[model samples]
Target: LHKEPATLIKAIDGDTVKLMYKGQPMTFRLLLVDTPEFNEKYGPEASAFTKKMAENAKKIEVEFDKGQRTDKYGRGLAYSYADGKMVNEALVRQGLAKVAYVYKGNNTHEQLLRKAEAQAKKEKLNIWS
Candidate 1:
């Protein structure tokens, strides 16, 4: 995601959300958040889960622009805030994902995301179980 907020175009899956970045269509993988694969256990469930939200989604909600631009896979790597919450952390809290990655520096969203994962686990949420 960009430091500047963008409009959410859609969600490819649980963690991969399509957004309009710099006036162009772009896809991003949530930093530090991983959802089940399209062929894995919760694959379709995860994709099917957010299909509607994608088209109707409005804003980047917020931004954690203190990090890199993209990941190794060439996917735009970012942390976005949507609907009053961090997108990645919200996914974790929703049990659609868990935090399993990190940045080299003391990125601000780390602690918040880790805690979200903990909460998801504590409640025996989707990905946890």
Candidate 2:
């Protein structure tokens, strides 16, 4: 996870967030994953789950590979971190999120996330519950 301080402004959706860091507004697309659509069965749970993870992270950190930092839509590709742990992975590990890989680059973190997700699935956490 990339270590940087940021404040969450809003939860755009389960997979996206708007944050302010260093006096600049930024949009973050949680990398290596996509969550259920807002109207889907697990949608509200996923959104709430992400918000819970990001909430109160006054000094949010992000980690990402050098591939496509921003998509054509201008959302940043990032892996979120807080308290020195990967927030995105935490979400998936709790079965609150899913692994989504749009493009491949340095997938080190992705691998770790998948492992967490598997364990979460095995435990039937959150969505699986």
Candidate 3:
């Protein structure tokens, strides 16, 4: 279980959201994964995939890396455990996301994500196929 748990109040595209961080509202970006843009090819599919996975999640947990950080647009970067499943890894494994090279520092899930991506490619799944 993660130390910080948040309710998934909203799903913004494939890998973004608004949630209650601790006790305050905050925008969160799923870390180490990049999905197709909402306006780009396969974008709608990715978003739909994410929504499908999240809808049944009873709880959403957000764990920050070194500290609370953000992307260029100031969206909080976090690893979300959705109903006990690693959201970042699931997205990659399902071929809904790619490992984002832009993530700085030594993120704990980097290797795991890469492995999932490889599995997706081998399966010729979704975006990978």
Candidate 4:
């Protein structure tokens, strides 16, 4: 299978999405990224932002580092990418999410994600505003 699932069909929330892969339904939890709650302060904006980015596609490339391939909930714990851009990091860069790395492992994208979140904070983008 491809590293990432393809075609974002529905966004369950800022942190979750329902995708289609191989004609089957798949859910993915954005790794190391947490946006506001649906009822939280900037929840709607965060969710809207995520939805805007995850356009329909055949496949999305997922990047993994330190976390388990699957979570206790059985959803994939992966950094999803499309068109060479990381969707998780994109949320942070847009100030729609915060860094939420709790597990340990590869962390290849940690530093870059941190910088993106910091810049979002500094620039007051989206929820950071």
Candidate 5:
């Protein structure tokens, strides 16, 4: 997928991030994954995972799907990349997130995400366990 450059401002949660995009700051919700809320079980770790990945990366970028680009709250809806690694997929593959907010015809990384999800389940990781 084509990606636009961005810089991480904060790791809001596992599934949400604050970033600077195109010289503007905004909140971004990961396109294909959901993690626990900040006060919920496994939430802190999930947030930490996102924070670590984002802070330690040398480059950050985002990819928007052909579908909706923003949520009702105006948060950018897209997949995030950290040093070329798909952070959304990493969260799923690591068992910190689950696939959510699905739509029929606008799925961009569902195949890749589903595979990671299945692997997480098979290994009985975090939410899967």
Candidate 6:
């Protein structure tokens, strides 16, 4: 995966973010994960978790998936990294999100994400409970 440097503008939610990428503001939808929306259960917790991760990171990067780069709403679809941790997988591991939005061609980190989700489920953490 080719990674591009970015700066966090806002962690809109666990699965969506607004960032400065290559001198422009971009909205990024974390690929292969689904978090509760603002009014849903665990929504605030998930968003806060993502915010803390982004705010505490010394460096931020993004890796686009193999297939589609943008969603229907024009948000960039990619995996986000804080320092070196993949935020998408972290959300799954914490049970703040579930493996979702999958497509056969754009499954770069599907197995890795699934593993984390399994661990979260086994632990019955957060949303998994």
Question: How would you encode candidate 3's per-residue C-alpha lDDT over 41-103 as one tens digit per residue?
Answer: 778988887777677788888887874477778788888888889888998998989998544
Predicted candidate 5 versus true structure: per-residue lDDT over 20-115, tens digit per residue: 999999999998788999799889989999999999999999999998888899999998999999999999999999998888654889999999
Better of 1 and 5 by TM-score: 5
lDDT of 6 by residue, 9-114 (tens): 9879879999999889999999999999979999999999999999999999999978998889999999999999999999999999999989987889999999
What C-alpha lDDT do the candidate models reach, one value each? Answer: 0.71, 0.78, 0.82, 0.76, 0.92, 0.94
Clashing pairs in 6: none
Measured on C-alpha atoms, candidate 1 has an lDDT of: 0.71
Runs of candidate 2 exceeding 4 Å displacement: none
Query: Which candidate, 2 or 3, would have the higher lDDT against the true structure?
Result: 3
- The residue pairs found clashing in candidate 1 are 1-78
Per-residue lDDT tens digits for candidate 4, residues 14-66, read 77888766577778888888889999977888777767677643356665565
TM-score, prediction 5: 0.96
Error of 1 at 110 (Å): 1.2
Candidate 1 lDDT over 31-107, as tens digits, reads: 78778898898777767655544555555643544667676777787776665456677777778876767767526
Model 4: how far residue 109 lies from native, Å: 0.9
TM-score preference between candidates 4 and 5, better one: 5
- Least accurate stretch of 10 residues (summed lDDT) in model 5? 99-108
Candidate 1 residue 84 C-alpha distance from true site, Å:
3.2
Candidate 1, superposed: residue stretches over 4 Å from native = 1-3, 50-52, 61-64
Error of 3 at 69 (Å): 2.2
Question: In what order do the candidates fall by lDDT, top score first?
Answer: 6, 5, 3, 2, 4, 1
